[PDB]
Design a binder for this molecule. Structure first.
Ligand SMILES: Cc1cc2nc3c(=O)[nH]c(=O)nc-3n(C[C@H](O)[C@H](O)[C@H](O)COP(=O)(O)OP(=O)(O)OC[C@H]3O[C@@H](n4cnc5c(N)ncnc54)[C@H](O)[C@@H]3O)c2cc1C
Ligand SMILES: [Mg+2]
Ligand SMILES: [Mg+2]
Length: 322
């Protein structure tokens, strides 16, 4: 193990992505990881105007014909439908027509008319995604439907990047997709990795404390990173499929701790829709998954499996219990 790692930084999927590898003689695995990230991003994205991704092709043929997909895309949609059903529909990967309408976080973000919202709300239904295992096809049964895998894609890509690392016998690494972090092994000095818990009121990178972890994923969601401000009001990017407007409760941010990044990524939307106390109860039903909640009043809460582990450092915030 090296003290100073091999590291590479790129700007993919609209954010800074950094990979670090501490195993001596594994520098070329950095390129293998970024190759895998770019491969999956091109299959999943709906934000490339000059190319038609696999998800784009599914959306173009909604209500027309099933679309052949690769194993990566078939699996991601498979899991997205599982998180959608488990959420009761609060999380729904068919929210595509609504999230494309607002386009929150992009240069052309817009608050749509109520008539525009009412036109896309009947299109959101995860049960209308028809899957054929033998043909490996995905079919949107209704015209106008659109998939949006943005809430689970980074977790899946993070897991697949770790798979490339493990296949190359990498033992000590840090995968940072911006809001999706996986720490592999321990610090070369023997300590657990001190993972920073994002400050939801400050730009990405600023933290309110540290969580020691090893071989674990930490995924972050918040309201102040991607939002649109019009006429005094702000609208964050986590939208309610039943109303067409953002989920507005007492959560400012939440960090979900899990063995697999797709699980923490996929559980975030349903957890977010339930507020602080309801979201904590939701996380307590998943063994091996825990979370740190941060209120709009700067109160910090730990689920049962994380009690006493989080090291709060920002004095603007206070630890609180239920
Ligand atoms: C493959 C890919 C390519 C991208 N390319 C670009 C790019 O070129 N330019 C750019 O500016 N951004 C791009 N992005 C978006 C960028 O990565 C965002 O910062 C990020 O996707 C926001 O998600 P999050 O993980 O930070 O938060 P999360 O909470 O994990 O994800 C929130 C996202 O999930 C979706 N969502 C919202 N409400 C719901 C709901 N109720 N149910 C289900 N899903 C919901 C929306 O897409 C929302 O943005 C891309 C994203 C992906 C996955
Ligand atoms: Mg995410
Ligand atoms: Mg997520």
């Amino acid at each position: 193990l090296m003290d100073q790692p091999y590291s590479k930084t790129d700007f993919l999927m609209g954010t800074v992505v950094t990979l670090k590898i501490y195993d001596k003689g594994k520098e070329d695995v950095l390129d293998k990881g970024f190759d895998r990230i770019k491969d999956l991003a091109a299959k999943i994205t709906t934000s490339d105007s000059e190319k038609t991704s696999e998800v784009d092709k599914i959306n173009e043929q909604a209500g027309k014909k099933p679309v052949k997909v690769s194993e990566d895309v078939y699996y991601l949609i498979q899991e997205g439908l599982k998180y959608s059903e488990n959420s009761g529909g609060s999380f729904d990967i068919t929210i595509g027509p609504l999230t494309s309408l607002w386009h929150i976080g992009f240069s052309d973000a817009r608050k749509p008319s109520q008539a525009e919202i009412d036109a896309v709300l009947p299109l959101i239904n995860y049960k209308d995604v028809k899957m054929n295992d033998k043909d490996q096809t995905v079919y949107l049964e209704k015209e106008g439907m659109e998939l949006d895998l943005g809430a689970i894609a980074k977790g899946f890509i993070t897991d697949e990047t770790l798979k490339v690392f493990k296949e190359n016998k990498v033992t000590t690494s840090i995968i940072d997709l911006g809001g999706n972090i996986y720490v592999q092994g321990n610090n070369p000095n023997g300590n657990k990795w001190n993972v920073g818990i994002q400050d939801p009121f400050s730009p990405r990178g600023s933290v309110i404390g540290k969580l020691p972890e090893s071989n674990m994923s930490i995924v972050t969601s918040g309201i102040y990173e991607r939002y649109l401000e019009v006429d005094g009001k702000t609208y964050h990017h986590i939208l309610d499929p039943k109303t067409g407007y953002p989920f507005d409760n007492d959560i400012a941010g939440v960090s979900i701790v899990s063995k697999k990044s797709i699980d923490g990524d996929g559980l975030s939307t349903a957890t977010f829709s339930k507020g602080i106390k309801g979201g904590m109860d939701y996380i307590e039903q998943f063994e091996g998954v825990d979370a740190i909640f941060i209120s709009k009043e700067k109160k910090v809460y730990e689920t049962s499996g994380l009690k006493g582990q989080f090291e709060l450092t920002d004095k603007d915030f206070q630890m609180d219990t239920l």
